[PDB]
Every structure is written in C-alpha cells, then in structure tokens.
Amino acid sequence: HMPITINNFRYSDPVNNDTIIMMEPPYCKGLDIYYKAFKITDRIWIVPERYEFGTKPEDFNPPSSLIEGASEYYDPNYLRTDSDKDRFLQTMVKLFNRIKNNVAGEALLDKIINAIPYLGNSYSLLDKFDTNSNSVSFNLLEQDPSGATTKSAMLTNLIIFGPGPVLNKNEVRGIVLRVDNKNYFPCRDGFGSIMQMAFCPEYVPTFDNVIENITSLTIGKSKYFQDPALLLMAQLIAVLHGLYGMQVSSHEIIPSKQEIYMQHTYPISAEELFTFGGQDANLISIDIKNDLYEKTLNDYKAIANKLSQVTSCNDPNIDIDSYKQIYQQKYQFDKDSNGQYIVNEDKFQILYNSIMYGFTEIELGKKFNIKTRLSFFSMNHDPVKIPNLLDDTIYNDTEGFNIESKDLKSEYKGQNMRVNTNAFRNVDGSGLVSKLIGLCKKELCIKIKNEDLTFIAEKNSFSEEPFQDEIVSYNTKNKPLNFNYSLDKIIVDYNLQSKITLPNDRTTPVTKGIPYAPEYKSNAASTIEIHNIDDNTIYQYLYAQKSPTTLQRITMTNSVDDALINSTKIYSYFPSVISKVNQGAQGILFLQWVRDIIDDFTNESSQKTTIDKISDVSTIVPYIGPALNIVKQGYEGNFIGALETTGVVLLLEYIPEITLPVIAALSIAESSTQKEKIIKTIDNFLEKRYEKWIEVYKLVKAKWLGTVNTQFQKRSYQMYRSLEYQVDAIKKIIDYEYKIYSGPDKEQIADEINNLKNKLEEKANKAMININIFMRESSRSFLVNQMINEAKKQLLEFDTQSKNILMQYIKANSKFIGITELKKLESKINKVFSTPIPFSYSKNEEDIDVILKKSTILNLDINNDIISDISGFNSSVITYPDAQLVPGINGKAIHLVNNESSEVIVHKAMDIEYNDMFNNFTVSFWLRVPKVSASHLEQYGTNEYSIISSMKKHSLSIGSGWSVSLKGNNLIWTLKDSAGEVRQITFRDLPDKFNAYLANKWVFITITNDRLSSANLYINGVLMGSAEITGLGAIREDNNITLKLDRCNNNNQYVSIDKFRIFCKALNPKEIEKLYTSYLSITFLRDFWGNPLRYDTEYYLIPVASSSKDVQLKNITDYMYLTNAPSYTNGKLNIYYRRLYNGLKFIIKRYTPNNEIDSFVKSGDFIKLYVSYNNNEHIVGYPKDGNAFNNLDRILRVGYNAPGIPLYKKMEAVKLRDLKTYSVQLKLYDDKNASLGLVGTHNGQIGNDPNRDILIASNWYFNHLKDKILGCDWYFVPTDEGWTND
Ligand SMILES: [Cl-]
Ligand code: NA
Ligand code: NA
Ligand code: NA
C-alpha cells in the first residue's frame, strides 16, 4: 500500500501554487476575498483562519450566558497572528501524522480522499458534469514571476478552518446552494460536496469514568481530557458521510422542555449518535435506520442513471470516462450489458453500512489507545487548554499523550487529569461561558450548570411507524434488521484494496451561483434562567454537602437547611459517621477515633439489600433516599418500603408513558393463484411478523435509552458527587483534628492517618461499585419488565390478529395449495404463533487469548444444570424436555437423542450479526458421536442428518444459513446463500475406528469461513477439509440456532455437543491451536473417550505407544504382558479396528481416604491400582528385591502375597506429558517415598515363557518426558454404549 503523504510547511513559506495557494473560499465565490491555504494531503486543504462565514464580529466575544448546550470558550484573539497561524498549521500536520500512523486512521483518510464529490447534483441538467459550482470547486489566484495573475479553480473534498466563535466546539458542514429560494445540500442526497470544518486542536473537552465498569487495576474515578487527534477524527467521520452524500437531516432527538430539571441542548442529529457509536446508536429505532437506508438507495439509483447518461463536462479538459471510473468505484456500481451503471443491493448494503456505521469515535479510540466517553450522555466538564501539543515529551504522533516511556500508556494515564497535570491548563475564566440555572429558596440562590441537568428526549423524537398498517404481497422485500459495520472489517477491506490515483483537481473558474453563507446561530444569551422553589430539591441536598474552602472545624448535620445556612456544617446521611466526627477532643484516643471513623464509614457506605418484588436487581443501596431526597409520601422514614411498593420507578423524576398504542395487524394484498407465489407471500408474511416484534422491541429500547436510562445514569453521577462530598468533609475533619492534635505519638501516627484517609477513598469507591450496579440493574429491569411487558402485550394481540389474516388468505387460496401442503401450513403456523420472540439484553489485541475472547459472539456453557450464553451478548437458550446432560470437557455437555423433545434452541440476541454482509465467521464445538455399528452403517450410511443448523425456517422449506450434518462416517459443513446456492465440506472419517474422529471420542471441531477464499474444517486444531466458497451470495440465516437430530432415520443415533461457540471472524491456525489447547487441562485426568477418569470404575489398559496390544496376566502373584488384541475388519463398509473390552480390567482406589467425596481422579492423586480377576481385586505392586531387568526395570506383580516381603503398591496418577492425548502416567513409590519409576513395558524373556513386552516400573522414562512416543503412556478404557464390537 502506497503511504499517504502529509505535506510540511511553515505559515510564512511563499505561495507555490501547489501546496500553498491564495484560495477564494466557497462562501466567498466571486467576491475576490483570498486567504493563504495549505494542502495537508490530496483533496484536503487547511486555511488557518477563524471560521467567520455568516458571522458578525461581536459573535466572537464571550456572552454573559448561553441559550443551551455545554460550556463554551470564546477568545476573539485566537488564531490572529502569523505565529498563531504557524502553530495551528504545525499542530494540524502533527495530528494528521498521528492519524495516518495507525492503519485505522490511514483507512479513514484513504476513504475521505477518494470519496470525491459528484460533479453535479439534483438541480443539474443530469447529462453533463458540472464543476462550475461552489459546492465542488473553489477559485484560486496564481501569480507568475512575470507579473500575470490568473484566476482558476480546484476541486476538493475538505477545507479545514480554525474555529468559529466557540473554540471547544468543532463543526462540519456541507456547502449549501440556494435554489428556488430554498436551502439545498448535495451532501444530503447522494452527490456529496466540498465539506467545511471549523476546528481547534488545543481547547479540548473533558469527561470522566464515573459510571464505567471497574478494572483489575483501578476502582477510583478520574476526569480525562480528550485527545485532539480523536476530536479531529470524529469530525472527519462527519466529512466522510457528507462526501458520500449521506448527511442525515431528518430524525433528530429533541430534548423535552417540560420541566426545569431537564437539560437544554440543540436537537441531536441521528448522525452524531452513529458517529459516536456503541449502544447510543440504538437511540435511533431500526425503522428509521431503514428509512434512511431506503432514501440513500434511491439517491444512489438516481446517481447510477445520471452517470450512465452523462454526455460531457462544462470543463472540456476533464476526462468524463475517467471520472466515470472513480464514481463507479465510489458508489460501488456494477456495469450492465449495455454498459449502464446499476445498483447491486448486496454491494450497496456493504457500502452504506460501512460509511454510516463503520468508523465510530468509540472504535477509533480503542485502536489508538485513546480514552473516550462510554455514553453519548456522559458528563462533560469544563474544556481545558493543551498548550504544548508540539512537544513530543507531552504529545507524540504515535502514542498521543499516552506515552509508554513515561508510563502513561496504561489505563490512558496520559489523559488522566489526576496524573498528567503537566499536559493541560484550566481555561481563562473570562472566556468560559455556561448555561446556568438559578434556584432560589423563598434568599439563598444556588447556580446549577446545564451539564448537571438530565437529558430527557421529547416524545416526538420517536417513530410511530411500527404501529401503522403493513402490506404483504409476493413482491414484498425483506428489510435489514441490523445496521452496523465493524472497524475491524473496514481495515481488512482496506488492506485488500489497491491504490486509486485521482485525476487532476484543476478546473475552470467558478462563475455561476451566489456565495450564500448560512447565518451563524448564536448561542449568546443575555439572561439567566431563575426559579423559586418551596421545598429543597436534589440540588439543595447536594449543595448542602459541600465543605468550605477556608480551613475551619467542619461538623455534620442530618438537616439540609441547617447545612445550607451554616458554612461550617455539612449535610450527611450516615448517622454513625456524624456522631463520630462531631465528637470533640479525644486526647490520647485520637488515632482510635480516626480508625473508628473509617470503620463507621465502611459499615454505612457498604449497606446493600434486596427486595423480592424486584427480583432481577441484585444490589439495592438504601441511603440513596436521604442522600438525594428521593422520598415517597407515607414512607418518609422508609425508602426500602417505598421502593418495595413503587418499584424502581421511584428513582425517576420523569415518569414516562410506557403503555403503547395498538399495532395494526399485517394485511395481504395478493391476487395471484400461482402456488409458488402464494407460498412466497406466506413466507414474506411470517418474516414481516418477526420484523414487527424486532421493530417494536427496538423502539421501546430507543425510548428507554433517551428517557429512562439517562436518569439512572444521572442518579449514578449524583451519588458519586455526594460520596465525594462526604469523603472530602471527613478528610478535612481528620486533617483539622490532626493539625491541632498534641500527643507524644503525632509524628509516628502520620503514616496511619494517611493510610486511613486512603482507605476512606477505597471504601467510597467500593460503595460506588454498588451504586453503579444498583442503577444499571434498575434501569435494565425497568426496560425488561415494565416497558417490554407493554410491548409484549400489544405484540401478542398483533400476533393473534395477524394469524387470523394469514389463515384467511390460506383458506381462500386452499384449492391452489393442496390438502397435503395445507396440513403442513396449519401445523407450521400454529407452531410459529405459539412461541413469542424473546427480548435479549445484549452487552455489545493484547494477545491471542484476548482476540479469541473479543471475537466471541456466542458461547454455550452449563452451570447449575442449565445451558446459557456466557459470551455477554445474552442470547436466549431454550432447553427442551429430552435434552440430556452427560460429562463434558469442563463440567457437563449437551446430549441429544433422536426424538422431537431432544432439542436446544438459541434465539440469537437482537444486535449480534456475525455472517451477514459477507462477514467472516468461525464456529467451534466439542463433539462426541458413537462408533456406528456395521449394521447401522448398512441401514443408514447414506442418511444425511443435521445436528446443528442456522438455516432459515420458511413455511414449507429450509433456506439460507449453515448446518453441521452427519452421513454415516462423514461430517458435513454446508453454507447456503439466499438464492439457494451451496458450498460444502465433506470430511470422510478415518476407517481405523480406534483412530477415527467420529467414533465415541470427544473431538474439537473448528470451522472457519473466509467469504473471499474458503471454508476450512479443523479437528483437534488440524486441518482436515477445505472448500472454496468464492462466488456464494449473501447468507440470511434464521434467528434460531438449533441443536437437534434432524431427519435422522436411526432411532438409536445420538450425539453430544460441548462449548458451542461462534466467532465474528475467520480464525487463523495459530488462533485455533490456542483455542483448542485452552480447553485442555491437566487437573482432571481423562479416560480413553475424553471423559473425567474415575475411582472405583473398571478400565481396560492400552499402551499409547502400542495401541493394538492388550494387557494380559500370566497368573495371580505373577507378571503382566502385552499381546495383540482381537481385530475386526469390514472391506464392504471400509471400517476396521482392534476390538475393545478384552484383556485385564483395572480399578483405581484412593491410596488413603481424604477429605474429598467426589470420585474424579485428579493429576497428582495417590492411588492403589488393582486388577479385577475371578471376581476379586488384586493389588498391583513391586515386591522388595523382586526381579528387575538389569536391576532397574522393576517387574510389576498382581496380588503378590509372600509373607514378610514388603510389596510396594503406592502409585501416583499423573499427567506429565502429551496434553492432547487422553492418556495417563502412573508413578510407583517404595515405602521410603523413593520413585521406583513410571509404569511402562520392557522387552524380555522369563523362564520358558515366550519373549514378551512385560509391565515394569522404571525411572528411565523421567529422562524422556519430552519424547514424542513413550512406553509409559496408558489409555484407560471403560465399557461404553457408544462402542460395541461388531
Ligand atoms: Cl521373584
Ligand atoms: Na494553535
Ligand atoms: Na459499530
Ligand atoms: Na454548609
């Protein structure tokens, strides 16, 4: 890949007419106003001027107040001098270097460079490329050494200016055109335009980690400043959307103004939420995302027609067909037969999603190791200045602030304001303006920042479209139910794309049109909002907790008013803490007093409870009530009682309407009498019905995010501020009392007093963990119970009505369908409508282990005899009555028999999608199938039956998806696209059933899928099968993943499945190897089948190094030896194997009874080994001075019974080698605990006996534990129903 060039320059560098020009900006078109401009890279210009278009000079002065939004820094003198301009320029170069220095950043820039605006728009002649517009070109003025000045023009993508009036609020806008006295944006209907950014690198926003999950290193909270490179990248994402003509301007989230506690902001564009990414993207309901997608599809279709029937350009020196090739590439159009450009919907979906959803602030932060806010509604604090971005000791172009050599990389410490105090300065107070609200009590007025208020979305933010009638026919198109795109996929795509060399930018001067700059929308206010309240609010309660700045003895009071009035009194709600801190001189009991404070704080702050009536909330912190003045009438002393009788809704200031209007039943308008069209219409209908459940669930979730979750988030913040106040006050009291303390031990105790203050903070941090859990669980619980309950109510009724409509249509068309088809329809439809769609509460590069963990989107585990998804995505798992449990790899596994009740169904969570849009994916699981008898191979060898399937369940057919199937001794992987085309791996198992993978042994399956190459089947980490899958279309699989024997004609067939798991990428051999090994442990020893090894269980012994041999006994008291096992061969069926269950049976017993009551044999357990013979157990050991080949290989004896002769029989069952084999080693000790060696064999001849491999113990093996093949490795084989000798 060709590196992206970033140009270098000083502001004072002479114009060169290449990288440094005199530009006439778009909104100065034809006015002859020029500014020095600098080409940072292809298609991107920097103009180090304040963005003044549409403003007046007073706009640049700090106002007294703001109308709305977060705090704003004004500075009219910013970016005025040449040295300022140079500093700006040098900073922007550095930021562009930072961005390109990471492949994710490189991908973003590459995408922006090549997304050239279309040479025309909706109001062009539609047959001719038009460069004569300020939407696509800017004029420049070029001076010759001779003295001639020519005015020409350049096409560009992006012009970046310095900031407007507000430094700390960056903006991106497209060029507007005035047509028919109306504002038209080509960047909004497919074409794109020049995009203009106003940007400031040095005045950055701040945020905190208050509501974030805990880490394993830190539990305390901090404020962070943002990295300007990420701020820039966030703006570039908006630019990208504009270039693709996909700027949103329709469905905004409008803040309610109903109440005084509600946050004032400009409406939030849907596009801002998409740019930010993560869970907040779901604030836009799926029906709206669909409306936006449909709009852009239409826009792109219209652009395909325009580009096809283009004839010429206003500029004759442009190459129309060369521009026609960038555009084909840009819009991912295909060519017709006639050479017309057409939309391929598959390609559109990939392109659209990648642009709207692909790059996000959250994703980019992770790639760059830059800390971002976790929530779009997370707390913003005052902005700060970064004065020294150009100093590599503070900020460099590979690591930003988070520099590894300063130990600032770990946990974004370089952005942490507690730590990196060198990197930032507080802004000048005279430049900082806020939206303040005064609260006056009837003459104390407190000032609340707009930031401290709660965002509540107004009802008109939310769609009602899912409630409206929906018409189903055969022509009915399936809508996408997921609109997302991984940055991971973009990067992969990028690395697989070749360079695109743009044509010349230069064009003819812009002469047409008027340079209408939209008027600045001033946030200046000359008033502050002021309210009188009767009763104390949350804000009085918080403010009452604030300590004075001036050093004095502080006391605590349980009275808010008392604290509001007195500057030395702090409101508290920890009565024991209060009692203790209010105490006077302790004299010599001072240290114990400080200890006592810490103890009381610990007990009081750690209070937690549960209420049965709120059964899915694990942690209730009772003191929230008195801390924030959350009180219910009649329960003034009883918050827990209040919560018990109200539910979590008690915690909400704004109580939303949660009941929902009726959902119109689906309707059918289909006249066709063709059977194929009727069935299609039914299939369409069933899908549409599913889509309704999803749409409504998503709408409710959107409303919850914008009206409910915001409040619970605020409660978290409020409680954090309260606890912070409490800790601060206590610290000040301890500090004050320590100061005036006189005692002989003052100096000596200084450390402990400091440790105790630290412990205070720790306990407060732990309380905050509880509070965060409380609010998260209360929020989820309100969504999942109260809100989604109402949805279900209406959806159940929708289902009933919709079922009637469908049954009507089938009855009316019954003569065209047929009685056999009609019976299937009936039972199918009854099944479908007798099961609701569940609601999922999804969660949504260190090393390989991390990569395996992060790319897992489903993971079935069994706990407490229950199968569930442990991935975090929270897919619902339904276990049917005859799904059975057996021993697994780690705990228990799933056992499926050939009946209808033997079934496990996974309903994938709402937001997971691992194999659409041609996404790469891997599926893995442990599998155990019985050795198929010769008889069943004859009867059923050609009967292909699935065991796992995602394949879409239509009314009368099975559609797109994947399946695992078996057919005799073949394991089959099938991919099916939405056209019915398939790709398959057929793995033919080994004929030697002792070594075979489908013969009663736990084996690890891994199937990777690379949509641009092939599907690969691995067993035990080894590649076994491959199929090219290139050319296969889109996979649109069922929501359900079904584990079940499907179409199996053998009533006795069964399978076991463990650790079923899906990854959202194609794993590479190293990853699979690591995945495979990660399941293998030495702790529990294994039998031959892969099950845990057990005491008091009969096992046949087989040596690994000689697996065709059985162990035999010469006689009681005597030695053991190897002989060939009887064998089975079947040429017809191409199967053979050494027969099992012949030869000596052994039993393992604990050497001495211990405090374990399970019967699992663990590695390192002391054992006695016995032979079961003549319905007796005979101990295996070595007699003292017994025969031993060359005095080293001790010959083992069975039931040796010679009086006065010590018999050594203490063994250790151990896993010392070969983790991938289900084999065991046995170590024998003498009575002085000296090793007599590992149990193996030695070739020899005793007396008249034939030459034999004789069982021994020998220390020789201990020098060979890394060898590939060792005679000390033993299989333990118990009789098993899965293996019967033929
Ligand atoms: Cl002997
Ligand atoms: Na600057
Ligand atoms: Na995303
Ligand atoms: Na006070």
Ligand 1 center to 1170 CA (angstroms): 20
Which residue has tokens 């937690």? 608
Distance 1228 CA to ligand 1 centre (A): 18
For 74, list phi and psi in degrees, rounded to 5. -110, 135
Tokens 């826009």 identify what position? 299
Closest CA to 930 of 1285, 1222, 1281: 1281
Note the ligand closest to the C-alpha atom of 489. Answer: 3
CB 1278 within 8 A of CB 1098: yes
Q: Residue 112's closest CA among 169, 156, 47?
A: 156
State the ligand closest to the CA atom of 566: 4
Rounded CA-CA distance 1140/1124 in Å is 11
- The residue numbers preceding gaps of C to N over 2.5 A in the chain are 442, 844
In angstroms, the CA 90 to CA 829 distance is 67
Ligand 3 centre and the CA of 426: distance in Å?
A: 33
Which ligand does the CA of 1194 lie closest to? 1
Eight-class DSSP state of 787? I
Resolution (A): 2.3
How many angstroms separate the alpha carbon of residue 1187 from the centre of ligand 1?
5
Give CA–CA dist 942/972, Å, rounded: 13
If one counts every other C-beta atom within 10 angstroms of the C-beta of residue 356, the result is 26
**Which of 298, 273, 112, 114 shows the shortest CA–CA distance to 190?**
298
CB 304 within 8 A of CB 119: no
Ligand 3 centre from 855 Cα, in Å?
14
- Separation of CA 292 and ligand 3 centre (Å): 17
Q: How far apart are CA 1140 and CA 1128, in angstroms?
A: 10
Cα–Cα distance for residue pair 1034/1032, rounded to 1 Å: 7
Distance 569 CA to ligand 4 centre (A): 4
Q: Which ligand is nearest to the CA of 486?
A: 3
- Closest ligand to residue 556's CA: 4
- Using CA atoms, how far apart are residues 468 and 474, in angstroms rounded to an integer? 20
CA 88 to centroid of ligand 2, rounded, Å? 4
Q: In this structure, what are the phi and psi dihedrals at residue 895, rounded to the nearest 5 degrees?
A: -125, 120
Write down the experimental method used for this entry: X-ray
**What separation in Å is there between the alpha carbon of 882 and the centre of ligand 1?**
57
Q: Say how many Å lie between the CA of residue 478 and the centre of ligand 3.
A: 22
For residue 77, which ligand has an atom nearest its CA? 2
Q: Which listed ligand is nearest to 1196 at the C-alpha? A: 1
Q: Which ligand lies nearest the alpha carbon of 571?
A: 4
Q: State in Å: Cα 1118 to ligand 1 middle.
A: 9
Interstrand relation of 470-472 and 666-668 (parallel, antiparallel or unpaired):
parallel
Which amino acid appears at position 709 of this protein?
N
Angle CA 302–305–309, to nearest 5: 140
In angstroms, the CA 1135 to CA 936 distance is 13
**Nearest-ligand number for the alpha carbon of 276:** 3
- Ligand 4 ion: residues within 5 Å (CB): 563, 569
CA distance 347 to 378: 36
Paired tokens of 979: 């056209």
CB 120 within 8 A of CB 49: no
Backbone angles phi, psi at 270, to 5 degrees: -50, -35
What b/e string do you get for 224-258 counting C-beta neighbours within 10 Å, with b at 16 or more?
bbbbbbbbbbbbbbbbbbbbbbbbbeebbbbbbee
- CA dist., res. 1034 & res. 975, Å (int): 10
Spacing, Cα 89 to ligand 2 middle (Å): 7
Nearest ligand, CA 386: 2
Considering every ligand atom shown, identify the ligand nearest to the alpha carbon of residue 228 and give its number: 2
Ligand with an atom nearest the CA of residue 1197 = 1
Q: At which residue do the structure tokens 């507690």 appear?
A: 418
User: Residue 1187 CA: which ligand is closest?
Assistant: 1
**Cβ(906)–Cβ(868) under 8 Å?**
no
Ligand nearest to the CA of 389: 2
| Dihedral sign from CA coordinates of 360, 366, 368, 373 | positive
Q: Give CA–CA dist 1211/1236, Å, rounded.
A: 10
Q: Determine the distance separating the centroid of ligand 1 and the alpha carbon of 1103, expressed in angstroms.
A: 25
Q: What is the DSSP letter of 576?
A: H
Distance of CA 197 to the CA centre of its chain: 31
The ligand that comes nearest to the alpha carbon of residue 203 is 2
Cα 391 to averaged position of ligand 2 atoms, centre (Å): 13
3-class DSSP state of 1045:
strand
- For ligand 3, the distance from its centroid to the CA atom of residue 482, given in whole angstroms, is 11
According to DSSP, residue 833 is labeled T
Distance 77 CA to ligand 2 centre (A): 11
Residue 192 Rama label (left phi>0; alpha psi -120 to 50; beta): left
H-helix or E-strand spanning residue 748: helix 746-781
Q: Can you point out the beta strands (E) in 529-582?
A: 529-533, 555-557, 569-571
Give 621-625's long-range contacts (Cβ < 8 A, gap of 24+): 621/719, 621/767, 621/770, 621/771, 621/774, 623/573, 623/574, 624/651, 624/715, 624/719, 624/771, 624/774
Ligand with smallest separation from the Cα of 568: 4
Å from CA of 582 to ligand 4 middle: 14
* Pairing mode, strands 1165-1173 and 1003-1009: unpaired
Q: How far is the CA of 378 from the centre of ligand 2 (A)?
A: 27
Query: Hey, what amino acid is at 326?
Result: I
For ligand 2, the distance from its centroid to the CA atom of residue 58, given in whole angstroms, is: 22
The ligand whose atoms approach the alpha carbon of 1182 most closely is: 1
Q: What is the dihedral of CA 50, 53, 58, 64, to 10 degrees?
A: -80
1178 C-alpha to ligand 1 centroid (Å): 17
Residue whose token pair is 């463990």:
1058
> In sequence order, what are the beta bridge partners of 1173?
1176
Q: Compute, in angstroms, the gap from residue 424 CA to the centroid of ligand 2.
A: 14
Question: DSSP letters along 463-510, please?
Answer: --GGGS-EEE-SSPPPPPS-----HHHHHHHHHT----PPPP-EEPPP
Closest ligand to residue 281's CA: 3
**Which residues are within 5 Å of ligand 2 (an ion), measured at CB?**
87-88
Yes or no: say if 122 and 130 are a contact pair by the CB < 8 Å rule: no
Each residue of 511-532: b (16+ CB within 10 Å) or e?
A: eebebebeebeebbbeeeeeee
How many other CB atoms sit within 10 Å of the CB of residue 492? 16
Q: Give the Å distance between the CA of 704 and the centre of ligand 3.
A: 20
1186 C-alpha to center of ligand 1: Å? Answer: 5
Using the mean position of ligand 1's atoms as its centre, give its distance from the Cα of residue 1198 in Å: 12
Q: How do beta strands 158-161 and 44-47 pair?
A: parallel
- Residues 1219 and 1084 sit within 8 Å (Cβ to Cβ): no
Cα(597) to ligand 3 centroid in Å equals 47
Å from CA of 561 to ligand 4 middle = 9
